Chain A
Amino acid sequence: PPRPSSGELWGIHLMPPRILVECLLPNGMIVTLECLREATLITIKHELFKEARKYPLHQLLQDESSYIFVSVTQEAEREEFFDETRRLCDLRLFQPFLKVIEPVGNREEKILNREIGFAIGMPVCEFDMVKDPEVQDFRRNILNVCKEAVDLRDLNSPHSRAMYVYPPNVESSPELPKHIYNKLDKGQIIVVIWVIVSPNNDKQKYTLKINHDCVPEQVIAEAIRKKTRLSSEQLKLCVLEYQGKYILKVCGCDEYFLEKYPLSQYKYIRSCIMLGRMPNLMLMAKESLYSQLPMDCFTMPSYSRRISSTKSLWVINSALRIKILCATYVNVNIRDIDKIYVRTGIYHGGEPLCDNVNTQRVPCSNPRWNEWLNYDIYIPDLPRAARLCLSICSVKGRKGAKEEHCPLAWGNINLFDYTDTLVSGKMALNLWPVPHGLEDLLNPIGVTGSNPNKETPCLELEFDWFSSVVKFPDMSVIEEHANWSVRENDKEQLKAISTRDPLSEITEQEKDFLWSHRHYCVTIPEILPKLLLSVKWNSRDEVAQMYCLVKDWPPIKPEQAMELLDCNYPDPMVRGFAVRCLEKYLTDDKLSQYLIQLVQVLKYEQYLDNLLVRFLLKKALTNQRIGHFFFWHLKSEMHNKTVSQRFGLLLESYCRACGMYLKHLNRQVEAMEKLINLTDILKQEKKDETQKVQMKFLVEQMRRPDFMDALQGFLSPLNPAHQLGNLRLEECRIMSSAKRPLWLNWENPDIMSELLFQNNEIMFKNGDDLRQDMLTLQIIRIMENIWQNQGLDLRMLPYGCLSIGDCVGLIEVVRNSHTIMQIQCKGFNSHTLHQWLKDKNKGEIYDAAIDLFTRSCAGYCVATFILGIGDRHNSNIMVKDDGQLVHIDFGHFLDHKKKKFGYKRERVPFVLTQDFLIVISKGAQECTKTREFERFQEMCYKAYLAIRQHANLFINLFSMMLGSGMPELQSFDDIAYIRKTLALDKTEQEALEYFMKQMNDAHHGGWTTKMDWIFHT
């Protein structure tokens, strides 16, 4: 099973310096050997075999080299220790012992399965045990994706290997916004190219001036020309013909310019132009990189070599009926509730296909019904994605006529299996606990399948029998049934419906209209989500026709196809169409930008094997930047039993084909396990000890060779292009906050670290759920991108944040930043903030600081209002010395105060205090009357309307995250908040009036508009 802790033994976080180890010799003898906690297995084996001579039957023992050790791990697995260089403290032993064995079987397979199992945080052998033929089919059938990916990697070796390991960090389009292009000197960029003139490793700079759209080779060519020598024009041209033997690298990190894209399309360069900063690049030989790249080999696993009448659904002439037999138990106080019943529904997504049907009410102590439930649905009319959603509810009818109904346990089942067979006969289903905050009696958004924990309420069911196996009809049979089923102001009406947000109201009249004009709809292909909701899914006549339209449907933008992958679109044809759009039009840039949502929608998939999982796995195995985050997002959810089987099987297939990255990922995983263990000691055994005592314990344990080996020389999980070198222990500290996070600092080991950052600072936090911050930071990045592409330079500077498990993760530290409270403490007055920024930015550079402060402040003012972020104060807002504002610890979004207080109003988390106003107004008396404030308001108005125009994207992104299990994001009614803050049911002008009134109410006046009252002009 999964490891209970990250400790060195069961119930012992850290082993004492010396420990007694029970050694089981192959002659049947037991030897107690005292070992040093960090001694390697080769040492222990040698010390044991010396000692073993002083014990009976020593003559039966072979040479020590004939044996390896085996023991039980904290995962209840008998692990064979083929790697004798590993230390005792790193073996994850359950108890202090080791059994001596002669190694047998496939050594190679066992070593790889251990490495995969270590990465995934679950033993591979657990999958071989699983009886479900769907799991065993998934494991075998997914290997074609693995083999495809690895073969595309060796296609154009070594360039194709380099392209996988170091993919180009490029924008989706080469076209630049006007305000970015105007920052250039007549379409030209000044770049600094550096050469490591080996030996002695000496640096030389070349202040080069070239066209922004120059392909990396064109940049290499100019560096060849501008080199210090003396040669003529014809001599400089022939030396340039010998080029293409070099590659461009970013100074300070592992970013490479390996593909022929305009220089300005590379995110580092684009960012450089924007910030006005000088791009520092390093020229290196193609061979220096290609030699460092190993050839990746995929091996077919052992499980691949081994093995683990029919009526159409449409010929079944009957209504749907399910027998609810009994439930083993329920946990209810018999004195507090009156009766228990089973609530059931037939769903397609989160929409019922017929009315919900309940069993009769029965006593708490006797959960037995033996009742056939009848549904108002004709069996042939069942759509392919139909599900049975049920729950055991309690009823408390004590106050008047008023009844209180609450779910006790829930479960969901696909009515058809992965092989299209309709469920038949008797079925036992283990129920799941009700998610905190969920008040609805059924949970149709929740996962399907039985609860793996069998010490839970088990509901016994019975499905109909039709003297045979019932299969859903084939496409050919569906297509023929669709044929059997068969002024221009209405063309303008369709255009208006297609522009509306995914959660805007659709009337029955609109549904009938959309369905009546389903054939003209093809002209406006983005109307497809609205049209699919108009379909009567409880009718095979309409569905068959919808399948015919979907097959020949024109492709839509990926940001629109993503909606068809959420919990509202369960149909495999609809999801298939959506996946094909992403295959064709989704760039690696955008895939990385929406990966988190794409991973969450995998949870919605009815089956393990589907087009989406195949698409995502292919991409993770074609692009290491995607692979890294694909791994960490799946790994972060491995504790969650609802999704751990699916994510574990997926992770297994990823780790089996990612090549050399498995070694780098295992280094990241073991660095994290040691940080989890260190923080667990401080939170548990050392919680009642002082900061000084905790720090002495910290410096002592961090200085251990086993700790220094694991936490130095690995890649940053926040950004794998960042190398974490030697730990700078004098900079490492425990924070005074409640969860006691670690503030860690590493050296950047890059030969040119001084041109990027010499130190990498990261916060490790154990105890807090980091998914909300993770989602908020991602939305801020998408908002800033919309703004920049529209001409608004509202710099947000969102720090990296990664959830690595259950309330555990990494938060990137923002360099040279100070909380508003830290500035206020150094001074008392409302001018203290503006005074600090004047002292930090003297003379000429003063205006740029006020401008940066104003721009960042406006971005945050609009972003926090739209999102409903956790309330702002002087301790969760920071300012950099350059003026850049950064908001930290968002924690909560949307209507998080809806239940707690009955008040219905949109909050303004970020109210600009007199102190912030004094900065923007450059120390003026009446702040709101200045030209600076007027310009700041205009930035807010522009930023707000820009996000409102892109509302469908933000609504889709939140809709895709409903699977996650974030408490503030459980239903579409939670997403209703951004529909209010973005005033989507109002006109563009009314929405701006709305935003202005919200700012006016919170700031007690001052917010005006240069535009007129009647028409905004």
Chain B
Amino acid sequence: NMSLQDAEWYWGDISREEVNEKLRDTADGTFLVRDASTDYTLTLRKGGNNKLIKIFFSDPLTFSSVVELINHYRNELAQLDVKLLYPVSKQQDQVVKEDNIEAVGKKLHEYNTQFQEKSREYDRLYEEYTRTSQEIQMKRTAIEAFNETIKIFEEQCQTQERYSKEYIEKFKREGNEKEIQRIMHNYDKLKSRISEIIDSRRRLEEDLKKQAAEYREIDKRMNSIKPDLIQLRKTRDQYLMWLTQKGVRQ
């Protein structure tokens, strides 16, 4: 009960959504105290969840102050089976390394400029990512349609062969040169066509190999921007909060 509003764990007028960002992926024992929607609310991290414990905890009240109730469980805490360990400190003062309103304001304008430019590049990359992913899907469907087409034209050669074998046998024995030439001319036209369909599939397979490579490169570029964009927003938002606190408040 040494201090009052000086305490590092007290945050005051901050929403549950803000506390959820502060406790995200934190170890069991992480905690912070804030003002209730009314009276205060202690939020404790336990088993991957944030636990809301109201401060009025049980009816026989042995706590004299908010700092006395916290420090009692901070040192030694089942009556469940969890003791208050690492408190979220007001660390956030270090993010803004400027003295006056003018210098902070100048740095916020810089960060916001960088953030909007990086946001615009991220959205452009995301549209390219989507478009590339969609076109890769189309080329994969078109290759399957080519495979099926080539199978049918091959079946056609086989069918031409089965049905002409005995007729070419007879025409050669009957001396009809014009009739054999007409058969092999059609077969040539069929083979010429299967060659053209095969080359078209081959070209599409190349374009897909190239677009699949572009995709991996777009994915890599986005996996690089994402963390840098998040950090930039965090900085920007921290400088904005600094200016709100330093400036005339309602």
Contact = CB atoms under 8 A, between A and B. Distances in A.
Interface of A: 1-5, 10, 22, 24, 26-30, 55-57, 60, 72-78, 94-95, 97, 99, 331-333, 336-337, 345, 351-356, 376, 394, 396, 399, 402, 404-406, 408, 433, 436, 439-441, 453, 455, 505-510, 538, 899-900, 902-903, 973, 976, 985-986
Interface in B26-75: 28, 37, 41, 47-49, 51-54, 57
B130 to A, nearest CB: 9
B142 A336 contact: no
B17 A973 contact: yes
Interface string B92-105: 00000000000000
Contact of A75 (B51, B141, B197, B219): B141
Contacts of B28: 355
Given A76-B147, A332-B220, A345-B48, 9 more contacts: A3-B141, A28-B160, A57-B163, A74-B141, A352-B49, A356-B48, A507-B53, A973-B20, A976-B17
B179 interface: yes
A94 B149 contact: yes
Contact of B148 (A57, A72, A332, A353): A72
Interface in B209-247: 212, 216-217, 219-221, 223-224, 226-228, 230-231, 233, 236-237, 240-241
A72 B156 contact: no
Contact of A902 (B119, B167, B236): B236
A506 B50 CA distance: 11
B164 interface: yes
B189 A332 contact: no
Contacts, number: 165
Contacts of A74: 141, 145
A94 to B, nearest CB: 4
Contact of A333 (B53, B157, B224): B224
A331 B53 contact: no
Contacts of A436: 126
9 smallest CB-CB distances across A and B, nearest first, come from A28-B160, A352-B48, A404-B227, A4-B138, A331-B219, A76-B144, A985-B37, A94-B145, A28-B159
B198 interface: no
B250 to A, nearest CB: 12
Contact of A355 (B48, B140, B161, B226): B48
B152 interface: yes
Contacts of B216: 331
Contact of A28 (B54, B133, B140, B163): B163
28 contacts: A1-B141, A4-B138, A24-B153, A27-B160, A28-B160, A29-B186, A30-B193, A55-B182, A56-B167, A72-B145, A76-B148, A94-B142, A331-B216, A331-B220, A354-B48, A355-B48, A394-B227, A406-B223, A406-B230, A505-B41, A507-B54, A509-B54, A509-B57, A902-B233, A902-B237, A902-B241, A973-B17, A973-B20
B190 interface: yes
Contact of A332 (B16, B190, B223): B223
Nearest to B17: A973
Contacts of B48: 345, 352, 354-356
Nearest to B56: A509
Given A22-B193, A74-B145, A508-B53, A356 B25 contact: yes
Contact of A4 (B142, B149, B193): B142
B173 interface: no
Contacts of B197: 95
Nearest to B54: A507
Contact of A505 (B37, B119, B147, B193): B37
A261 B236 CA distance: 61
B52 A902 contact: no
A935 to B, nearest CB: 32
Nearest to A356: B48
A337 B145 contact: no
A127 to B, nearest CB: 16
Given A354-B48, A406-B223, A900 B54 contact: no
A55 B186 contact: yes
A28 B157 CA distance: 7
Interface of B: 15-17, 20, 24-25, 28, 37, 41, 47-49, 51-54, 57, 116, 119, 126, 133, 137-138, 140-142, 144-149, 152-153, 156-157, 159-164, 167, 179, 182-183, 186, 189-190, 193, 197, 212, 216-217, 219-221, 223-224, 226-228, 230-231, 233, 236-237, 240-241
Nearest to A5: B138
Nearest to B167: A57
Nearest to A973: B17
A399 B231 CA distance: 10
Nearest to A93: B145
A899 B37 contact: no
Contacts of B212: 455
A76 B145 contact: yes
Nearest to A976: B17
- Most B CB atoms within 10 A — which of A399, A406, A973, A986? A406
A29 B53 CA distance: 83
A4 B204 CA distance: 14
Contact of B189 (A30, A99, A973): A30
Nearest to A407: B226
A337 B221 CA distance: 11
A29 B17 CA distance: 72
A687 to B, nearest CB: 15
B223 A337 contact: yes
Contacts of B228: 404
B142 A10 contact: yes
B16 A4 contact: no
A406 B221 contact: no
Contacts of A509: 53-54, 57
B92 to A, nearest CB: 12
A22 B196 CA distance: 13
Contacts of B138: 4-5
Contact of A30 (B145, B162, B190): B190
A2 B55 CA distance: 58
A404 B231 contact: yes
Contacts of A355: 28, 47-48
A902 B116 CA distance: 12
Contact of B223 (A22, A30, A408, A973): A408
B137 to A, nearest CB: 8
B47 A354 contact: yes
Contact of A903 (B141, B220, B240): B240
Contacts of A333: 220-221, 223-224
Nearest to B212: A455
B159 A26 contact: yes
Contacts of B116: 900
Given A351-B49, A508-B53, A29 B141 contact: no
Contact of A352 (B47, B157, B162): B47
A351 to B, nearest CB: 7
A69 to B, nearest CB: 12
Nearest to B156: A24
Nearest to A355: B48
Contacts of B41: 505, 507
